[PDB]
Subunit: 400 residues, 4 copies
């Protein structure tokens, strides 16, 4: 049987399995024992760890693993999207140390976004739940403009493409507005403000904010999502260009009717002050990598149409004035924000979040931007890499 | 436990003898064509044994072994449904449905400037070549027409393949759009000004006759030696009427955009020539598949282009390939593509297949009405969009799967 | 061998002149007996008409009244004013008025400003004080964007050219030019910045009072008012202007210590200042007269402020029509959305045309037609030649 | 009338020595070579002391122009005083040595000349006023004026715009104005159609001859050949206009470009060009011959477009600060018109970064800071500016 042919894969003709030897075997998969998809099995494990280490014969094991048996077998039969995760991890680690020596860039100074220039984190979450982090991946920071795809996805998920693009375009710019008196795309302030004005119309901005927070919670598999009121208050006083954009959008009747523009700006600053870590945000990115299903809970969070549209606009409009150079050389949908995050999606493989506060002169984190170039020079993750003929690039999706 | 031995019983149901037509029908249902260059030796020994045994058109397990030995590895992938699209017969009928549904779209004007860009507005063909060589066509797939601007990616690929990314893009940019960008470089190689500069990098220091022959040899390899020709009628008329291309040529000279030692008027003559190269949908679809297949021609197995050239060329087609429709196209279709004024759309679905749709009537942006309609429908049906998910794709069909 | 050497010019042999025959002769010059430069002489003339009846002036009853103003009166009667045959010129103004009166296109401004499309007036004030009006010339209307030159003139007069132009550019027209300065003071972003330089370190009530007292000097104290109705509606409908105000703040365009939202309220206020065509024509004549109000003789603006204001009106005055207008008309001009067109003919006269229905560029249909006709008739174009001008009339001439 | 100029010139003295009439004449600003004085200097070359019948025998034919001169009725009455101010202005710009000669014929950076011709024929020069140089883009007004004189405003402006640039073409696929290369090439293709370009060239030369009072107008084949070899941008503009169907039907674009290079290589001096500019200053009448050369509509349209489009990217700053119609050329000339007063030509080859002569541009700023010649100076209240049109 299934649990019986996973007991001998782990027990090497060796009668009973110590608990530490199943847990390391599991963690070697890249899964984390805190995975929400393994709770009942770790529940049954801290349950029988109270009948005091401990060692499991073939029926105590089966009593623990049957409830999660298929997820555990895909894990141990090297059937996950990256079969040799431990080797992949060391490459990610090599990449991390190589970006750490890049000291260019100036921390964002206009608010409050003066962190230390030494912070640098990278987190990975594959579409199968495999996790790895290195550096400062548990330090909270605000999403800033990396929330623009997340809220655009929510708007399309709830209302559909054709309604959303009555109000915002789908192409890069160079004006705020294009020739249809629509903002160019939802990845820029003029576009994201309009998108902010379509989410949950007909409810106050406090209930609106709760809905987006519940939505982001699903997207992160309930990992860390918070709010920084210091950044919200300080975004509010420094948002002169955003008020200019707000009034211009109102004068050009860009919003759906019944909108209170000044309130939408307040809501918009709020969404920009939402806090994440690199671990929690990399999971948000993996939901986008995984067709709308959160990879560590298995629930459908976004329509496949929402995810596709968002991945498309991140590809073409995601990195400010660097997005064309970025699309050419990196070939991955990505979104940078001014706190220094780069939300990065490798479709069908993984999502990631790099964070280092020092920005370059187009507003992208120097260390994150360096990491993304290096990552695609190593692995055939570029969108128009070939999955079969890829020269001397490494491919983490196949065996030895 | 022999390879030729257990492809014999896969095909021999009961029986120890396989009629030859029972092998040929099975072969073609995989989508391979008996003319495939990768099967030539086995097709030769099959017609030879039709000359050396008086009918009794039947293959025992050592007559089978004598014929398929040459190509047994390609043949088992075919018969073990290991090609990128295993149920090709079902997929083709979907292609056919899409063909017929675009056939009812009669908009658009045939190109008026010339010298027979005055084709019939009723010609409409689509050809498919997967990365494993499986082929299907429907409609007018054997009528010659000029590549026009569907040569811009191919020659950029040749230039990058010979010279590298970094040299080529000293001279042309890598982004969508006054002709020149902030660096007095053309915006990208998919627009006339960029393609004129790229044309001026291929095979420098050689006269325009070998320059042409060199590019012609290259397209032949990219097309697995299917039809690649040249229309001197179209060249002569592109030359007389290319007032704007001459304006671009001089502007590029004045802004020193060309390489040292370039003869501008000759480069423009070369440029019109490359625009008058002829294909069909079958031969061009194979060119598209070479780009879909990382640089290896899928029906010959030869490496034609570096994987760096193919990636660069696919990226710019994605962003700059469909004139002013390229953002809408990139959003809704999500595929690398290139339109030309003769009415072709070279189309690449990375890792699966290449296609060439051809219908002469263009819409107001210069794209074939029926081709553009065909491409929306295709991605509405199949999860080929660049950012479709290979695991969660709603009601979309996936031709890469079974059942 | 002076007051009595103008008495014989008016007295036909006769050594006694009836007052109405002096009044008729006076008004034929185009002067108004209400002219502030004639007040004393009209005072001593009504006093004499009180203290005696023989309504007749002997050679010192005349001399007792015109003594005060003898220099202006001799220039008037010796036909030394810029347009000597004013009665004939007037007759031409009337002809042009009637020909524009038959142009009924255009839509009135749709954001109350819903006036009548019937109103149509033109008033003329030469640089010597000669006046003429025809049509609806005493109806109040808001200056709207015809205040942009007047306030720029005030700012340069008080602060100088090179200070003001640290803050606003000087050339025709995305809101900001190549140097993160608005393009010129004749457009909203430029006018908002200019508004933020007038009378700094003062609350918006003295700022408004200061400009109103200034406009009064430019108008020789004819009607200058304020419409709170238009101000409230300018305040409610100014979404685009609120957008411009913030963009200017973000690109650090105001002078330090500016309250941007307050400046916008001042800006809406200045757009709601009210004039007639008569009072405004005098405002225009002040710019036409090198900075001196023509009906009081007072210096209102420095000649440098007037030049800069006239130079920018030429190039930036009529919204997107300013290139065609500068070609075909060649006169400094400024249109407003209430339907006025402030028009200056340098060295000759100022004018104010008013008709609310605007064409698609925001200019009064009738005013624009009047201005083309005027320059086809007279050699007032900036680059008409004063000696060889084909079939054009020259009103500065005694033909 | 002739007898009342005889006593005006003599102290009552006897008769008038001729050298003492010539000095009196030259002090008005008139030049004795003036074509309007041919007959009177003819009658003097026939004849050392003049009583009222030798005087009247010579001045009878020109007595009205001579009394206007001697009764101080010319546009600048105290010309000798004005002249010294021009000299001061010239000397003050002479010390501005920035700028680079155009490197696509290298003249000397030492040359610097200014010549003046009022609308009444009064002339003054300083510096290198007789050294020939090519007009380059200072022919664009002159070539536009000829076209409008012959064809009318509405025909010329089916083909060219009338507003500054800010694409070669505007919203109507017409070039922006005739003061830029794309506009001047179109203007060149309207002059004297239906005649080959050699006769076309002869005609513009005859036209420029009238505009200059038959002073020096020439042609430099060196500049023509070098314009031809260096004109890649002009060849690019030519083809773009052909594709966008901007020329009148029956145009041979490549030939028009050859004509266009020719017109830019026409040679003038500052003296002859100042007369050309004075013709524009004087409503189309040449001031040293009195003939109607251009329609008043052609001249007005030309002055309007020089004002707004004349000084390359400097035309907006220039129109504000100087307020005079002007056109600069890359050989270093600035054709400058003061409507109703005078025409001028400054020439100094070293150009600034916008393509305008450093010394000429300095002179034009200084000239308007000194005199109330700016378009929107007031003729009555002008602060401490000088007015050469008045007596004190
Ligand atoms: N790129 C960013 O993160 C900018 C966000 C910033 N709060 C804004 O809206 O202007
Ligand atoms: N766009 C096409 O398909 C061809 C373009 C055309 N041959 C040109 O060079 O202008
Ligand atoms: N009069 C006009 O042309 C516009 C005036 C108006 N108050 C504004 O600022 O927009
Ligand atoms: N700049 C000029 O005035 C003349 C030179 C110009 N490049 C031309 O010959 O067309």
């Amino acid at each position: 049987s299934l649990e019986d042919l996973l007991f001998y894969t782990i027990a090497e003709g060796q009668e009973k399995i110590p608990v530490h030897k199943f847990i390391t075997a599991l963690k070697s998969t890249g899964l984390r024992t805190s995975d929400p998809r393994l709770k009942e099995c770790m529940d049954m494990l801290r349950l029988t760890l109270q009948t005091t280490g401990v060692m499991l014969d073939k029926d105590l094991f089966k009593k623990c693993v049957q409830s999660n048996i298929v997820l555990l077998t895909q894990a141990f039969r090297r059937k996950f999207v990256i079969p040799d995760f431990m080797s992949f991890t060391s490459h990610i680690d090599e990449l991390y140390e190589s970006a750490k020596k890049q000291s260019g860039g100036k921390v964002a100074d206009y608010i409050l976004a003066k962190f230390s220039p030494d912070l640098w984190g990278v987190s990975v979450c594959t579409v199968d739940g495999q996790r790895h982090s290195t550096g400062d991946t548990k330090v909270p920071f605000c999403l800033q403009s990396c929330v623009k795809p997340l809220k655009y996805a929510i708007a399309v998920n709830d209302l559909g493409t054709e309604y959303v693009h009555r109000y915002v375009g789908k192409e890069p710019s160079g004006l705020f507005l294009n020739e249809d008196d629509k903002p160019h795309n939802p990845m820029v302030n003029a576009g994201a403000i309009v998108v902010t004005s379509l989410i949950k119309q007909g409810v106050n901005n406090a209930e609106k904010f709760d809905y987006v927070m519940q939505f982001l919670n699903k997207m992160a598999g309930n990992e860390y999502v918070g709010f920084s009121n210091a950044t919200f208050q300080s975004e509010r006083e420094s948002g002169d260009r955003n008020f200019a954009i707000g009034y211009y959008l109102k004068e050009k009747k860009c919003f759906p009717e019944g909108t209170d523009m000044v309130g939408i700006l307040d809501f918009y600053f709020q969404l920009c002050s939402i806090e994440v870590t690199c671990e929690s945000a990399s999971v948000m990115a993996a939901t986008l990598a995984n067709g709308g299903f959160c990879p560590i809970t298995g629930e459908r969070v976004l329509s496949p149409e929402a995810v596709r549209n968002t991945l498309s606009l991140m590809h073409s409009c995601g990195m400010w004035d660097f997005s064309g150079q970025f699309a050419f050389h990196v070939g991955l949908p990505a979104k940078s924000g001014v706190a220094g995050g780069i939300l990065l999606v490798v479709p069908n493989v993984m999502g990631m979040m790099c964070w280092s506060p020092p920005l370059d002169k187009m507003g992208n984190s120097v260390k994150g931007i360096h990491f993304c170039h290096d990552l695609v020079s190593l692995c055939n993750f570029h969108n128009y890499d070939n999955l079969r003929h890829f020269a001397k690039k490494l491919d983490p999706r196949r065996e030895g």
